[PDB]
Amino acid sequence: IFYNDSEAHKYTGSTRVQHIQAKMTLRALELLNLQPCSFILDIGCGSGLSGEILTQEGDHVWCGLDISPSMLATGLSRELEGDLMLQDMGTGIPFRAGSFDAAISISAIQWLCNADTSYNDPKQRLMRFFNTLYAALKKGGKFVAQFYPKNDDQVDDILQSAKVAGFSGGLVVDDPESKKNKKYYLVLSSG
Amino acid sequence: MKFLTTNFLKCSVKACDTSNDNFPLQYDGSKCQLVQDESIEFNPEFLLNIVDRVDWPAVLTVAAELGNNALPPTKPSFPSSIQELTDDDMAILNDLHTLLLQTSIAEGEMKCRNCGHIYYIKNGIPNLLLPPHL
Numbered sequence: 620i621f622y623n624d625s626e627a628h629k630y631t632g633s634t635r636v637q638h639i640q641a642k643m644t645l646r647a648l649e650l651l652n653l654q655p656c657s658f659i660l661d662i663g664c665g666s667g668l669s670g671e672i673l674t675q676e677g678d679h680v681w682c683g684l685d686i687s688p689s690m691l692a693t694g695l696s697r698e699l700e701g702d703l704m705l706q707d708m709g710t711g712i713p714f715r716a717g718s719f720d721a722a723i724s725i726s727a728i729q730w731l732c733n734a735d736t737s738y739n740d741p742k743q744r745l746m747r748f749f750n751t752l753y754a755a756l757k758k759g760g761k762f763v764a765q766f767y768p769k770n771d772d773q774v775d776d777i778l779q780s781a782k783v784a785g786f787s788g789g790l791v792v793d794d795p796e797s798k799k800n801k802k803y804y805l806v807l808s809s810g
Numbered sequence: 811m812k813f814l815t816t817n818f819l820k821c822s823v824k825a826c827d828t829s830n831d832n833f834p835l836q837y838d839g840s841k842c843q844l845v846q847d848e849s850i851e852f853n854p855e856f857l858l859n860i861v862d863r864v865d866w867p868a869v870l871t872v873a874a875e876l877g878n879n880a881l882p883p884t885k886p887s888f889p890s891s892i893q894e895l896t897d898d899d900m901a902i903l904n905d906l907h908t909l910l911l912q913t914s915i916a917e918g919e920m921k922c923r924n925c926g927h928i929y930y931i932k933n934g935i936p937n938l939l940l941p942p943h944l
C-alpha cells in the first residue's frame with residue numbers, strides 16, 4: 620500500500636501535478652488518434668485527472684480502474700462522468716471480450732514491476748495484465764500507456780509481455796535528451 | 811455504477827474466465843439502490859457507437875433484476891449515422907441514454923452466477939479486489 624487520504628489529496632490538489640498529468644493525457648490521446656464518443660478503459664485512473672480529459676477532449680465514455688481507495692475517494696468529489704472501480708490491474712481486466720474501443724494509462728503500469736502487493740511474480744501479473752487487456756479490447760483496439768521505467772530491462776520486459784499477448788506497435792519517447800523531462804509512451808494495437 | 815457498465819463487467823476470478831456464466835453478474839434487486847443522474851448530456855453519437863456491442867439479453871436480465879420489465883424484447887436498431895436519424899429513432903435513443911447512461915447503482919451487491927462470488931458497491935464504486943487464491 621502506498622497512498623493514504625492525506626497524500627491522495629496533496630497529489631490531486633497540486634497544480635504542478637495537474638498540469639503535467641493533463642499534458643501527458645493529451646499527448647496519449649494524440650497518440651491514440653481515436654474517433655470522438657468512444658468507449659474507453661482508464662487504467663490506474665487515480666483521482667480522475669486523466670479521466671476528466673477523456674470526457675472533455677473526446678466526449679468519451681470511460682471506466683476507471685485503481686487499486687487505491689483514497690485516490691478513488693478523492694475522485695468522488697471531482698464531478699467525474701466516468702465509472703470508478705476499485706481494482707488491481709495485475710489480476711486482470713474484468714470485462715467481457717471486445718468491450719472497449721481503447722485503453723489509456725497515465726503513470727501507472729510501472730507498478731506491475733513491483734512485487735509487494737501480491738504473491739504472484741510481477742512476470743505473471745504482467746502477463747495476466749496484457750492477456751486480459753488484449754481480450755477486453757475490440758479487434759484493432761488501441762492501448763497507450765505513459766509509464767516510468769526504472770531501467771531498460773523493465774522496458775524490454777514490458778514490451779516482451781505485450782508482444783506475447785498479441786499486441787503490435789512500439790515505444791514513443793518525448794524529449795529524450797532530457798532525462799529530467801523525457802517521457803515514455805507505450806503505443807499498441809490489438810489484432 | 812452505471813447500468814451500461816453492468817453490460818460489460820464480468821466476474822474477476824480467473825477460474826471463471828471460460829464460463830458462460832461469468833457474465834452478466836447477478837444483481838441483487840433487494841440491496842441495489844438506484845439513482846438517476848441528468849448531468850450526463852444526451853450523447854447519440856456514443857450510443858450509435860456502442861449499440862452493436864451491447865448484449866441485449868443481458869440488458870433485459872439485469873433490468874428485470876432491478877425492477878424494470880418494461881423494455882422491448884429485441885435490441886433497438888438504428889441507421890448508421892446521426893443525420894439519418896428519424897424523430898422515432900431519436901426518441902428511442904433518448905430512452906436508451908436514460909436507461910444506460912443516466913441510471914446507476916449507488917449502493918448494492920451482485921454475484922457471479924458461476925462461482926457465487928459476491929461483489930459490493932459503495933458510493934457508486936464496485937469493489938473488485940479478490941483474495942490471493944482467486
Ligand SMILES: C[S@@+](CC[C@H](N)C(=O)[O-])C[C@H]1O[C@@H](n2cnc3c(N)ncnc32)[C@H](O)[C@@H]1O
Nearest residue numbers: 640663664665668685686687707708725727730
Ligand atoms: C501517479 S498516479 C496517476 C493517476 C492518474 N492516471 C493521473 O494521471 O493522475 C498512478 C496510479 O496508479 C495506481 N495503481 C498502482 N498499481 C495499480 C494496480 N495494480 N491496479 C490499478 N491501479 C494501480 C495508483 O493507485 C495511482 O492512482
Ligand SMILES: [Zn+2]
Nearest residue numbers: 821826922925
Ligand atoms: Zn465467478
